[PDB]
Design an enzyme around this catalytic site. Structure first.
Site, PDB file in Angstrom:
ATOM      1  N   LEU A 162     123.753  50.714 -84.554  1.00 20.70           N
ATOM      2  CA  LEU A 162     122.433  50.127 -84.690  1.00 20.70           C
ATOM      3  C   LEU A 162     121.392  51.210 -84.960  1.00 20.70           C
ATOM      4  O   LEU A 162     121.668  52.409 -84.900  1.00 20.70           O
ATOM      5  CB  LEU A 162     122.075  49.326 -83.443  1.00 20.70           C
ATOM      6  CG  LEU A 162     123.007  48.168 -83.098  1.00 20.70           C
ATOM      7  CD1 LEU A 162     122.460  47.399 -81.917  1.00 20.70           C
ATOM      8  CD2 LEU A 162     123.190  47.254 -84.290  1.00 20.70           C
ATOM      9  N   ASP A 163     120.177  50.774 -85.261  1.00 18.03           N
ATOM     10  CA  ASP A 163     119.047  51.657 -85.489  1.00 18.03           C
ATOM     11  C   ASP A 163     118.169  51.698 -84.242  1.00 18.03           C
ATOM     12  O   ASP A 163     118.358  50.933 -83.295  1.00 18.03           O
ATOM     13  CB  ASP A 163     118.248  51.184 -86.707  1.00 18.03           C
ATOM     14  CG  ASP A 163     117.408  52.283 -87.319  1.00 18.03           C
ATOM     15  OD1 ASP A 163     117.471  53.425 -86.820  1.00 18.03           O
ATOM     16  OD2 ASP A 163     116.682  52.001 -88.294  1.00 18.03           O
ATOM     17  N   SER A 164     117.203  52.620 -84.247  1.00 17.80           N
ATOM     18  CA  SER A 164     116.250  52.695 -83.144  1.00 17.80           C
ATOM     19  C   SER A 164     115.385  51.447 -83.066  1.00 17.80           C
ATOM     20  O   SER A 164     114.987  51.039 -81.971  1.00 17.80           O
ATOM     21  CB  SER A 164     115.374  53.935 -83.287  1.00 17.80           C
ATOM     22  OG  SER A 164     114.653  53.901 -84.503  1.00 17.80           O
ATOM     23  N   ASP A 199     116.499  48.428 -83.857  1.00 14.67           N
ATOM     24  CA  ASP A 199     117.379  47.466 -83.202  1.00 14.67           C
ATOM     25  C   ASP A 199     117.457  47.726 -81.705  1.00 14.67           C
ATOM     26  O   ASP A 199     117.475  46.786 -80.901  1.00 14.67           O
ATOM     27  CB  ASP A 199     118.765  47.519 -83.835  1.00 14.67           C
ATOM     28  CG  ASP A 199     118.766  47.033 -85.264  1.00 14.67           C
ATOM     29  OD1 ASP A 199     118.098  46.016 -85.539  1.00 14.67           O
ATOM     30  OD2 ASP A 199     119.423  47.668 -86.114  1.00 14.67           O
ATOM     31  N   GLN A 200     117.490  49.001 -81.315  1.00 12.08           N
ATOM     32  CA  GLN A 200     117.510  49.348 -79.900  1.00 12.08           C
ATOM     33  C   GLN A 200     116.227  48.913 -79.203  1.00 12.08           C
ATOM     34  O   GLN A 200     116.268  48.400 -78.080  1.00 12.08           O
ATOM     35  CB  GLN A 200     117.737  50.849 -79.737  1.00 12.08           C
ATOM     36  CG  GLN A 200     118.052  51.285 -78.318  1.00 12.08           C
ATOM     37  CD  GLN A 200     116.822  51.729 -77.561  1.00 12.08           C
ATOM     38  OE1 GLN A 200     115.758  51.918 -78.146  1.00 12.08           O
ATOM     39  NE2 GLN A 200     116.960  51.897 -76.254  1.00 12.08           N
TER      40      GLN A 200
END
Ligand SMILES: CCCCCCCCCCCCCCCCCC(=O)OC[C@H](COP(=O)([O-])OCC(O)COP(=O)([O-])OC[C@@H](COC(=O)CCCCCCCCCCCCCCCCC)OC(=O)CCCCCCCCCCCCCCCCC)OC(=O)CCCCCCCCCCCCCCCCC
Ligand SMILES: COC1=C(OC)C(=O)C(C/C=C(\C)CC/C=C(\C)CC/C=C(\C)CC/C=C(/C)CC/C=C(/C)CC/C=C(\C)CC/C=C(\C)CC/C=C(\C)CC/C=C(/C)CCC=C(C)C)=C(C)C1=O
Ligand SMILES: CCCCCCCCCCCCCCCCCC(=O)OC[C@H](COP(=O)([O-])OCC[N+](C)(C)C)OC(=O)CCCCCCCCCCCCCCCCC
Ligand SMILES: CCCCCCCCCCCCCCCCCC(=O)OC[C@H](COP(=O)([O-])OCC[N+](C)(C)C)OC(=O)CCCCCCCCCCCCCCCCC
Ligand SMILES: CCCCCCCCCCCCCCCCCC(=O)OC[C@H](COP(=O)([O-])OCC[N+](C)(C)C)OC(=O)CCCCCCCCCCCCCCCCC
Ligand SMILES: CCCCCCCCCCCCCCCCCC(=O)OC[C@H](COP(=O)(O)OCCN)OC(=O)CCCCCCCCCCCCCCCCC
Ligand SMILES: CCCCCCCCCCCCCC(=O)SCCNC(=O)CCNC(=O)[C@@H](O)C(C)(C)COP(=O)(O)O
Ligand code: SF4
Ligand code: SF4
Ligand code: SF4
Lengths: 115, 157, 79, 99, 178, 208, 114
Positions: C37-39, C41-42
């Site tokens: 995931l991406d930041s 998404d986090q």
């Protein structure tokens, strides 16, 4: 019977006018036609939100004063009494008490609007 | 022709007479052209004598006199108050700005004519057009909606 | 602190997140090096934790919350 | 101007002003719409001698602004001054000081 | 110099007559009555309304109206395709294309004025060295479509042929000032 | 004497030169240049760090009393490193004088707002930010003031095109006013109105 | 190569401000869709917000990132207080604008623009 008849005639006339006003012209309504009016822009909030009242004390005073009016209204039949001195004294007392209440509220700044 | 066609033509004449004798513009203006518009409202020309009376709300308006420079920031508002007018509505563009942009045609923030936003019935040229010219445009609009044949077209459908 | 309840509701919300395969999901699976995931998404996951738990999580803890285990023991020592 | 004397007296009494002396409608006191042709005068430079343009070239007498101090050009008991002498107080009007 | 519009000088003290006058002013609405009287005077005045279109507001020969292209009395076009009007047009409302004519004359093949773009400023007619382009006094030329206000050379020459009896008289009355 | 040339008074030039020396020696930490034009106008060019002290001193000093900010604007000269020249024109009613204070900025170095000195600077700095992109520190509410909502780019910059990048039209499929890439029925015809001959020998720059 | 910072000394707290702005936009999207009568869903609005952030995702200068955050907060305020209208919000989607194809053959068939 006659008063009821003329009231019903007024009701029928106004219902006929609004009915022909709604069924006579050509209908073309869409979303932007029937959106509410806010001088060209969308309304920020609904108009059903609370809307502050700065003369609420004056409205309550209006309730009390309207009942004072209801008390004062049988005077045109009260002036026909035999004991006009009692009626005159009682009417003077009522109007003076009403005036003193108004003066007290004016002194206590109740007639002034909040904020 | 048919007898009913004559009755329909006379009813068309009556409806057009009512709508052209009662033309209420929206109290809407943008610029110097709207200054000339209130100079038409002024006692010399008397739009009220012609039967033309300003109403503030678009719901009571019949015509919309776009008098001024329609900017990009103003265009949604102009479209909104046009759409909120009821159906027998007309548009009179007034001045070079509302016609085709005018002196601000090549500007980044100016709509090049209000006909890109609303359907314009009558264009009044000038910068500003005089109150004489705006009154002429109003009378020309009255003639145009006198020429309308709505019930006759409906009958011929 | 109802550790099993908070951990399986965290896993429930992580299942409800649509960019994560529930089969590949686990308690110790990292968001970036495992789930990919991406930041953003986090931080959407952290916002989901916020709006499902009713308390605010600051940004300084967001880069430390990297696995569901970090989330559950963080909210354990916060509650 | 075509008003009867009764209506004129009524208007003057109702307004408090003599309206007939100063009418807001123009009748005949205005200039005629057709005028005799003019003959406009010429300016001071319309002369055939001593009129060289270099002696009246005001546009080319503009100089670049004078640098009072500079951080690069200058590379840097007196009294304090003001940008101008203080503005003199306005006198009250002798024509109509109060309304 | 300056004056005060609302500042009062000293005081008028208190008097029974002055108090009664102020009491009558407050109770009997005297300034409201004289405002009513002013409106009554205006009612009995004569209105300043002309009977348009049968009566027109006054104008001057300097009036800047609908554009037109003029001719010499021989009938030759005055325009020599010099593009001074196009150069000075503040709204860039003039488009000019030109070529030598069949007789070698320097004439336009395209003279367009976007009247929806024009600002009616007269810079073209005051920059024209041969009085070709003018703003004739027509102002009642409102159209029903946007296209009809995009004039070309045929429209401007037709306007010049239509309004020459008035434009020439206005230029005769005006040209000594300009 | 000459009817076509403006009369020139030297007393205003002397007074403005004296006051420029006065301000320059009072504030040597920030003042970079002081000049008086031939039109009798005083300009003080300062470092961007000294905007607040310079404006406060000019407003509150007894000998300055420039209590009225005439206007605040920016000039885009995109050939220097700091392309935006911020200009403050100020009016002293006490001494019936006007002064101009200049400073510099680029696209990425904001300068301090002077809303705490003059309240008109609020809307003036909003206009400067909206038209040039010069951010202002400690502004109470900095946002666009003249462009449309969601307008991208600062249109008073030199490199911004005159017609912009988008134009609005009413689309009937979506029943909205929509933005499209700009297309002109007639392109703006640019003109090369520059004479190839030098007009003012007093402003002849030396050759490179 | 040494410059004056705006808000962020380096990229880390700049990315922190970016994450805060993204959080605010993510929270504000459902309220915007509910308040302005938008045809779009909540998923589409958050996708558009993510698309804008990823469009600006390539920058590495802290001052540019700070100015982007400031601009995003200005647009966020224009959406929170209803100053952007339905048209202004839907201008992010370009649903009336056909997209120019990215292939050489289609650009060759359309016109001379590369
Ligand atoms: C009561 C008063 C009635 C009006 C009246 O008598 O006015 C005359 C006259 C009006 O004075 P004015 O304001 O100076 O007149 C304007 C011009 O001076 C003079 O105006 P003008 O010269 O421009 O033209 C005047 C001419 C204009 O003539 C017309 O308009 C004729 C119209 C014919 C139509 C067919 O004649 C009249 O106005 C004559 C009076 C007509 C009164 C009509 C009343 C009934 C109207 C219809 C009811 C249904 O009245 C008086 O002077 C005293 C009024 C009080 C009398 C009691
Ligand atoms: C310089 O800066 C600027 C401004 O700042 C100064 C601006 O402002 C500005 C904006 C500028 C503008 C918008 C221009 C606007 C112009 C003005 C503000 C000046 C104009 C002045 C006014 C509007 C004031 C007008 C005052 C009046 C007294 C006129 C009267 C008007 C009225 C509304 C009242 C009269 C009512 C009507 C006309 C309608 C009445 C009639 C009816 C509704 C009919 C009802 C009857 C029936 C239904 C009866 C039916 C029953 C029957 C029995 C009939 C029988 C029928 C049969 C068929 C038999 C701009 C752009 C600007 O730059
Ligand atoms: C006279 C105007 C009122 C009227 O016609 O109302 C009828 C209403 C009007 O409804 P409407 O709104 O569709 O009216 C048609 C449009 N104008 C107003 C322009 C006439 O209904 C109809 O005309 C059709 C309804 C079904 C009719 C079935 C047969 C009836 C015999
Ligand atoms: C007492 C005070 C109030 C008095 C009110 C007025 C009384 C006298 C009215 C006389 C005219 C009556 C008909 C008015 C019709 C107005 C609307 C209209 O023209 O609609 C056109 C329309 C035309 O319909 P159409 O078939 O052309 O299509 C309409 C739909 N579009 C245009 C979108 C395609 O309707 C009619 O023609 C209906 C005629 C009804 C006639 C009744 C008599
Ligand atoms: C009622 C009056 C309607 C308007 C009459 C014409 C207006 C112009 C009159 C002249 C003028 O300008 O006078 C200014 C003058 C005022 O000028 P002033 O403002 O300089 O005041 C004079 C100075 N002091 C303050 C000392 C009084 O008006 C008057 O003098 C009289 C005004 C008061 C009396 C009229 C109003 C009260 C009437 C109450 C009883 C009802 C009467 C009958 C009604 C019948 C019909 C319903
Ligand atoms: C018996 C009692 C009932 C009699 C019948 C009359 C009923 C009157 C009811 C209301 C009376 C209120 C009086 C007190 C009061 O509230 O006065 C307020 C008023 C100032 O308040 P305001 O009007 O808001 O002024 C704006 C701010 N300066 O203050 C004033 O206006 C001051 C008034 C001073 C004079 C009072 C009356 C003197 C009468 C002498 C008569 C001699 C013969
Ligand atoms: C309803 C629809 C309305 C839509 C409104 C859209 C709002 C647009 C707001 C835009 C705000 C911005 O552009 S701030 C983003 C720019 N900042 C950056 O790029 C910072 C550096 N970038 C990064 O670090 C990027 O890698 C990432 C992807 C942002 C973070 O990745 P990490 O993992 O390494
Ligand atoms: S056309 Fe001319 S007068 Fe009319 S709004 Fe535009 S600039 Fe003003
Ligand atoms: S009047 Fe002015 S704007 Fe109009 S065509 Fe002539 S020069 Fe151009
Ligand atoms: S200025 Fe006159 S002669 Fe020159 S191109 Fe224009 S209309 Fe023709």
């Amino acid at each position: 019977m006659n008063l009821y008849t003329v009231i019903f005639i007024n009701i029928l006339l106004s219902l006929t006018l609004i009915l022909v006003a709604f069924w006579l012209p050509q209908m073309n309504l869409y979303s932007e036609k029937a959106n509410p009016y806010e001088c060209g822009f969308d309304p920020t909030s609904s108009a059903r939100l609370p809307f502050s009242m700065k003369f609420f004390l004056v409205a309550i005073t209006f309730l009390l004063f309207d009942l004072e009016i209801a008390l004062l209204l049988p005077l045109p039949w009260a002036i026909q009494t035999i004991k006009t001195s009692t009626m005159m004294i009682m009417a003077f007392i009522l109007v003076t008490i009403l005036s003193l209440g108004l003066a007290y509220e004016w002194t206590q700044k109740g007639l002034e609007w909040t904020e | 022709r048919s007898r009913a066609e004559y009755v329909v033509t006379k009813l068309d004449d009556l409806i057009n007479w009512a709508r052209r004798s009662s033309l209420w513009p929206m109290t809407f203006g943008l610029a110097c052209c709207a200054v000339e518009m209130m100079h038409m409202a002024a006692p010399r020309y008397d739009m009220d004598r012609f039967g033309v009376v300003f109403r503030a709300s678009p719901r009571q308006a019949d015509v919309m006199i776009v008098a001024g420079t329609l900017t990009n920031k103003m265009a949604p508002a102009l479209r909104k108050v046009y759409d909120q007018m009821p159906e027998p509505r007309y548009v009179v563009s007034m001045g070079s700005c509302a016609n085709g942009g005018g002196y601000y045609h090549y500007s980044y923030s100016v709509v090049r004519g209000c006909d890109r936003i609303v359907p314009v019935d009558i264009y009044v040229p000038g910068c500003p057009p005089t109150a004489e010219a705006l009154l002429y445009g109003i009378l020309q609009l009255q003639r145009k909606i006198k020429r309308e044949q709505k019930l006759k077209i409906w009958y011929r459908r | 602190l109802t550790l099993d309840g908070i951990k399986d509701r965290v896993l429930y919300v992580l299942k409800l997140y649509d960019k994560i395969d529930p089969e590949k999901l686990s308690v110790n699976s990292h968001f970036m090096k495992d789930l990919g995931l991406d930041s953003l998404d986090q931080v959407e996951i952290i916002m989901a934790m916020e709006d499902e738990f009713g308390f605010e999580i600051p940004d300084i803890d967001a880069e430390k919350l990297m696995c569901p285990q970090e989330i559950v023991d963080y909210i354990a020592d916060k509650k | 101007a075509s008003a009867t004397r009764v209506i004129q007296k009524l208007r003057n009494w109702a307004s408090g002003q003599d309206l007939q002396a100063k009418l807001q409608l123009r009748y005949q006191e205005i200039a005629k719409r057709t005028q005799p042709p003019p003959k406009l005068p010429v300016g001071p430079s319309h002369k055939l001698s001593n009129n060289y343009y270099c002696t009246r070239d005001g546009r080319r007498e503009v100089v670049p602004p004078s640098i009072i101090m500079s951080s690069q050009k200058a590379l840097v008991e007196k009294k304090a001054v003001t940008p101008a002498p203080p503005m003199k107080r306005w006198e009250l009007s002798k024509d109509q000081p109060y309304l | 110099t300056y004056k005060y519009v609302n500042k009062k000088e000293q005081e008028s003290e208190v008097d029974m007559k002055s108090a009664t006058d102020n009491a009558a002013r407050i109770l009997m609405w005297t300034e409201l009555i004289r405002g009513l009287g002013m409106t009554l005077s205006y009612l009995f005045r004569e209105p300043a309304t002309i009977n348009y279109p049968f009566e027109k507001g006054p104008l001057s020969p300097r009036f800047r109206g609908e554009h037109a292209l003029r001719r010499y009395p021989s009938g030759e076009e005055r325009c020599i395709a010099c593009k001074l009007c196009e150069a000075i047009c503040p709204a860039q409302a003039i488009t000019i294309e030109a070529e030598p004519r069949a007789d070698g004359s320097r004439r336009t093949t395209r003279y367009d004025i976007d009247m929806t773009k024009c600002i009616y400023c007269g810079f073209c007619q005051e920059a024209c060295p041969v009085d070709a382009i003018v703003e004739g006094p027509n102002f009642e030329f409102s159209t029903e479509t946007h296209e009809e206000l995009l004039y070309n050379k045929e429209k401007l020459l037709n306007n010049g042929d239509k309004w020459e009896a008035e434009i020439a008289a206005n230029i005769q009355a005006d040209y000594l000032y300009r | 004497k000459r009817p076509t040339v403006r009369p020139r008074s030297d007393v205003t030039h002397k007074q403005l030169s004296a006051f420029g020396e006065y301000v320059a020696e009072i504030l040597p930490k920030y003042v970079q240049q002081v000049q008086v034009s031939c039109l009798d106008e005083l300009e003080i060019c300062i470092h961007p760090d000294g905007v607040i002290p310079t404006l406060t001193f000019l407003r509150d000093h007894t000998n300055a009393q420039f209590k009225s900010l005439a206007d605040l604007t920016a000039v885009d000269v995109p050939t220097r490193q700091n392309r935006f020249e911020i200009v403050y024109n100020l009016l002293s009613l006490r001494f019936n004088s006007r002064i101009r204070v200049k400073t510099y900025a680029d696209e990425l170095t904001p300068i301090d707002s002077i809303v705490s000195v003059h309240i008109a600077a609020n809307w003036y700095e909003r206009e400067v930010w909206d038209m040039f992109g010069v951010f202002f520190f400690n502004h109470p509410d900095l946002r666009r003031i003249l462009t449309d909502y969601g307008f991208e780019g600062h249109p008073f910059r030199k490199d911004f095109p005159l017609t912009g990048y988008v134009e609005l039209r009413y689309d009937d499929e979506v029943k909205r006013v929509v933005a499209e890439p700009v297309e002109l029925a007639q392109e703006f015809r640019k003109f090369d109105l520059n004479s190839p001959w030098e007009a003012f020998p007093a402003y002849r720059q030396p050759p490179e | 190569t040494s410059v004056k910072p705006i808000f962020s000394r380096d990229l880390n707290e700049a990315k922190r401000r970016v994450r805060e702005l993204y959080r605010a936009w993510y929270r504000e999207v459902p309220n915007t869709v509910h308040l302005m009568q938008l045809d779009i869903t909540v998923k589409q609005g958050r996708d558009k917000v993510r698309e804008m952030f990823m469009k600006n995702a390539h920058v590495t200068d802290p001052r540019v990132v700070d100015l982007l955050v400031i601009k995003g907060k200005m647009e966020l305020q224009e959406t929170i207080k209803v100053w952007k209208q339905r048209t202004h919000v839907m201008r992010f989607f370009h649903e009336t604008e056909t997209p120019r194809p990215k292939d050489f053959l289609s650009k060759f068939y359309m016109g001379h623009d590369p």
